Design a binder for this molecule. Structure first.
Ligand SMILES: [Mg+2]
Ligand SMILES: [Mg+2]
Lengths: 167, 61, 106, 197, 122, 127
RNA sequence: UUGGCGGAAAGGCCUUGGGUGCUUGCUGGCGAAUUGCAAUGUCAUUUUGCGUGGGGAUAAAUCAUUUGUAUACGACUUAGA
RNA sequence: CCCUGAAAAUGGAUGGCGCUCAAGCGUGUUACCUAUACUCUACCGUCAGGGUUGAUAUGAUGCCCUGACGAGUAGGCAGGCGUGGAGGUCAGUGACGAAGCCUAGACCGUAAGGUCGGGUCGAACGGCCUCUAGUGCAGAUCUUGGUGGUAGUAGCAAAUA
RNA sequence: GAAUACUGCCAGCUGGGACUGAGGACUGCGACGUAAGUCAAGGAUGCUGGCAUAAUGGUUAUAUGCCGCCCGUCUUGAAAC
RNA sequence: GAAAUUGUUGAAAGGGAAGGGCAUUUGAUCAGACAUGGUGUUUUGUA
């Protein structure tokens, strides 16, 4: 023989883990996030754009919309750690956001065989967007320059110190 | 750093598990180490320590 | 507009060091604008990216990124300590580096 | 904050300016120093001439050509004082020192740019009134610099051209200030005043 | 192998200062060149595109004699002979083209960005 | 397909080389301790090579494990291979270097039938 | 495109005239999604090569020979359609 | 406090640059920098104290729980790695390629070392339990043999050509 | 007749940041609950995305920052002129 | 058919030595895991 033997073999049975003590209490959001707040998207595809916050979802995410007529941002969910809660506030009472949940946004995950060598939208999503944004823009038309403010992008100029800036 | 008041890592200096390779003696010390562990009698501990001893520490009687 | 910057500029000064022994695991970052630890406490926990270029295209890009975060303040003048997944290559002493505003508390 | 920082060297102290500038280069800021003939060194002119003669004595005995080089221009004196504070024998030190150029006078690349000062190296802010100081151009032409008068003539010409520039700039800014004052006290002016601008 | 040899004007062709005229080496090398050209015409080569593609010289075993030095001593007097080989080839055209396929890996964000560019422009 | 294990950590993945094995050709780079009286390596001066010691020892739950998660077991024939029949998730076979190709195909066939992993299933193979 | 000015390292600054594009000075209409909750998410300038098609111009140096104002050898100074 | 007293030989050293309401001297208050030191955690080893022969399956010198500790020349002891040969065993490997050698190719061990892949090659060799010794090299102005730099260098100039 | 400073205490509340997640059925001490039960109570789980390949990683060469004197020996003392 | 030492080719670096340690960039090179049992038969060689 090349190698002799081990005198004892280790057991192949896998043991069970111990009973954990990590329950899930819900997320306690920061105080500047109330529904109706204008946020600035810090990262993502729509970074630097100002959106309005509607509903706190189940997986600790924030439901936001542009509105899509203003700056082209659709109904979407974002992470609360990737936004800045500005002091600008509009009222979102009169919008029925209880339809949306975590199952409303499903990616329909792709198989490993389908490889995009070189290279669409839900109709339910597009009239849901058209229902909500026409209720938001009626609240936008009350105070002046909000449509222009939401259409314009946010960016840091020379001499802007974010530890001194108030949003 | 520790100001050591004793010698670190020193052996106890008392012989356990006797240096002989006698298999029947090893069976005997197995039996009496069971008895010394669990019968809580001092006799078993005494004879278990006496089983470890060398030849000059076991004079004939 | 003409500006699209959503980060704060900073400079990679040096490693954490004594007079004659350096430690590459902790880098020292000068964030511009801040000149005191009390103002530097705003930037703790923020992500830092060192963004550089290479000749060979790897996965669709010739631009490679090294990620890290701010951990604590350093000294009395607003220099911060930063840790990266892989340490900064030490030829970047004085190189520009980006401090992002996420994870935000505001 | 800036791509290139142009420092007017007039009225500055040599060591304090060099310790500011060396740290700026090691941090990665590009610095150009103009008007190097108007630097100041604290102390008597005779003390600093004696100091330069003590430096000038030092040379390699078996071959003076490989010894310490005693540069005579004020810019090269400043370069010596700054190379003393940069670790110049390493690649990081060389890369730092190639971010610096120091000039006597203000050359035509930089006569149309903006000059700054360093307030923690200014002589009027650092020295007690009454202490004596030197001028680096006077010391340098005492120890062998040949071009003190041609720099003075070029600086006189440049100052004449700059005053001709400044008269037009002052007239234009007085027109702009007049128009801003007359176009103030409108509704947009009062709204900007309420908002802080 | 050029230390302490004389300097000459004929090294200006090669940008050197130290050059010589090793006549015996030239005789042996040009004899081998003639033999290789003969082998090439025997093989049926073009005899006009030939360039010397390979040549190397390395050391043969030494040949030793004796030298007589002062106070009755013996030293060595050794010849250092040579093994020489050379290969002449025809100068051909350009070698090759059509490099590797270089299959690309893109994330979903990169694919969405390329699709967005292709949509947003023509 | 291996047994679950913690993350394998090597405390010192660099090879300990003898001092001046780079300097002299007569000094091989197998590790020898410096017993000299003035040796900077023995005296552990700053900036010199580190020495092997017991603190670099691998974790006992992680020791002798391949990156796949098995322990290598050398095999020479089918009877040596069959000893790992009930221990497939802990051991992986490695055919010895001196086994011929016409026996190697037999060992690979039997290991594929028994579900045993072979760490070198490419030696002496013709294509 | 007209006229100046600038030699310290000018190589830049100012100005005349017309063309053309934009204008968020003010008020409207349409588009954006799917990069799926972030991944620098790629927009800068430095050098070179190879193609087009449009201009522009048609040399010297070295070795070898010679000189001796030079010279260990190199180098130097001369001459030679 | 400063100055005179205060003179040595290569050019020169508060470490250097330099510094003058100091970056000097005396003194006080805070903040800050970092040692293989201290605190907490993980891992390795050592030592100590304990638990555990019950059935099934192995190893009771095993497995497990707890705590503390870790510098080291001369020197002592212990556990291991490697070499030539011998008894036993694997009905071990091998001309479908043993041994050897090369390999900024891979894996394991803290390490001595072990294993594999590729190339070269051509006839024997290995694992484990034990036995034995002419058993491990960088040095000894070590021994024998081979080879460098020096170096295409010193030089190959007495006896008329 | 008060306040405030200074010092000290709270088994007072609360925000940000960094490093660590060892162990592996249950057993213990507790807490909130009338009870069922629940819990932050003898060591990390839940949700999600990208990639599934040289991307992370290993090795090796180079570059950069800081450090690093030639080994063996005698010696109180060796990098030793 | 080893090493010292040498030639050619290839790659790399080089402002008064070279070599080393910790860390990372860059270039080159390379191993491992990627199936798993599975409701299931959308099935062919019908199990
Ligand atoms: Mg002779
Ligand atoms: Mg060696």
């Amino acid at each position: 023989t090349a190698q002799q033997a081990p005198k004892w073999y280790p057991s192949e049975d896998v043991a069970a883990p111990k009973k954990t003590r990590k329950a899930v209490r819900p997320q306690k959001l920061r105080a500047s996030l109330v529904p109706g707040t204008v946020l600035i998207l810090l990262a993502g595809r729509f970074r630097g754009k100002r959106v309005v916050y509607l509903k706190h979802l189940e997986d600790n995410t924030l439901l936001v919309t542009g509105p899509f007529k203003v700056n082209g941002v659709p109904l979407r969910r974002v992470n609360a750690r990737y936004v800045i809660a500005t002091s600008t506030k509009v009222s979102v009472e009169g919008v029925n956001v209880e339809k949306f949940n975590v199952e409303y946004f499903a990616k329909e995950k792709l198989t490993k065989k389908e490889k995009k060598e070189a290279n669409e939208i839900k109709t339910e999503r597009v009239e849901d967007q058209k229902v909500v944004d026409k209720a938001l823009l009626a609240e936008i038309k009350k105070t002046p320059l909000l449509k222009q403010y939401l259409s314009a992008s946010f960016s840091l100029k020379n001499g802007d110190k974010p530890h001194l800036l108030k949003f | 750093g520790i100001d050591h008041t004793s010698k670190q890592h020193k052996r106890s200096g008392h012989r356990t598990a006797p240096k002989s390779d006698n298999v029947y003696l090893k069976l005997l010390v197995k039996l009496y180490t069971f008895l010394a562990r669990r019968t809580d009698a001092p006799f078993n501990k005494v004879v278990l320590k006496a089983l470890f001893l060398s030849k000059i520490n076991r004079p004939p009687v | 507009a003409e500006s699209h910057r959503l980060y704060v500029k900073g400079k990679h000064l040096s490693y954490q060091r004594s007079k004659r022994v350096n430690n590459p695991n902790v880098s020292l970052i000068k964030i511009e604008g801040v000149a005191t630890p009390q103002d530097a406490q705003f930037y703790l926990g923020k992500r830092i990216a060192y963004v550089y270029r290479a000749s060979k295209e790897v996965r669709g890009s010739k631009i490679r990124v090294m990620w890290g975060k701010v951990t604590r303040t350093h000294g009395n003048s607003g220099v911060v300590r930063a840790t990266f997944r892989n340490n900064l290559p030490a030829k970047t002493f004085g190189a520009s580096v980006r401090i992002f505003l996420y994870p935000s508390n505001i | 904050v800036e791509p290139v920082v142009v420092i007017d060297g007039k009225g500055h102290l040599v060591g304090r300016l060099a310790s500011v500038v060396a740290k700026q280069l090691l941090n990665g800021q590009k610095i150009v120093v103009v008007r190097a003939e108007e630097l100041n060194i604290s102390g008597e002119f005779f003390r600093n001439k004696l100091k330069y003669h003590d430096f000038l004595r030092k040379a390699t005995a078996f071959n003076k050509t490989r010894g310490p080089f005693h540069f005579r221009a004020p810019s090269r004196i400043f370069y010596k004082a700054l190379r003393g504070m940069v670790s110049h024998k390493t690649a990081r030190g060389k890369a730092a020192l190639e971010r610096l150029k120091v000039f006597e006078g203000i050359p035509p690349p930089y006569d149309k740019k903006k000059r700054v000062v360093v307030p923690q190296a200014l002589r009027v802010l650092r020295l007690k009134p009454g202490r004596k100081y030197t001028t680096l151009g006077k010391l340098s032409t005492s120890v062998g610099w040949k071009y003190e008068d041609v720099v003075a003539k070029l600086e006189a010409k440049r100052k004449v051209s700059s005053a001709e520039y400044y008269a037009k700039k002052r007239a234009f800014t007085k027109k702009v200030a007049s128009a801003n004052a007359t176009a103030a006290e409108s509704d947009v002016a009062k709204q900007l005043a309420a908002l802080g601008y | 192998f050029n230390s302490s040899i004389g300097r000459t004007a004929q090294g200006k062709e090669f940008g050197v200062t130290k050059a010589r005229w090793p006549a015996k080496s030239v005789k042996f090398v040009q004899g081998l060149l003639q033999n290789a050209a003969a082998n090439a015409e025997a093989k049926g080569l073009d005899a006009t595109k030939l360039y010397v593609s390979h040549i190397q010289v390395n050391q043969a075993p030494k040949q030793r004699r004796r030298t007589y030095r002062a106070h009755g001593r013996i030293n060595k007097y050794e010849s250092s002979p040579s093994h020489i080989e050379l290969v002449v080839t025809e100068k051909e055209e350009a070698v090759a083209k059509a490099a590797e396929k270089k299959v690309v890996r893109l994330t979903s964000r990169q694919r969405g960005r390329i699709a967005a560019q292709k949509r947003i422009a023509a | 397909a291996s047994l679950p294990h913690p993350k394998i950590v090597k405390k010192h993945t660099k090879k300990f080389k003898r001092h001046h094995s780079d300097r002299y050709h007569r000094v091989a780079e197998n590790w020898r301790k410096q017993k000299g009286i003035d040796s900077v390596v023995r005296r552990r001066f700053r900036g010199n090579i580190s020495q092997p010691k017991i603190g670099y020892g691998s974790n006992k739950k992680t020791k002798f494990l391949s990156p796949s998660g098995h322990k290598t077991f050398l095999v020479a024939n089918v009877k040596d291979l069959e000893t790992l029949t009930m221990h497939t998730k802990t051991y992986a076979a490695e055919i010895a270097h001196n086994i011929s190709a016409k026996n190697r195909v037999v060992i690979l066939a039997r290991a594929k039938a028994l579900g045993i992993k072979v760490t070198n299933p490419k030696g002496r193979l013709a294509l």
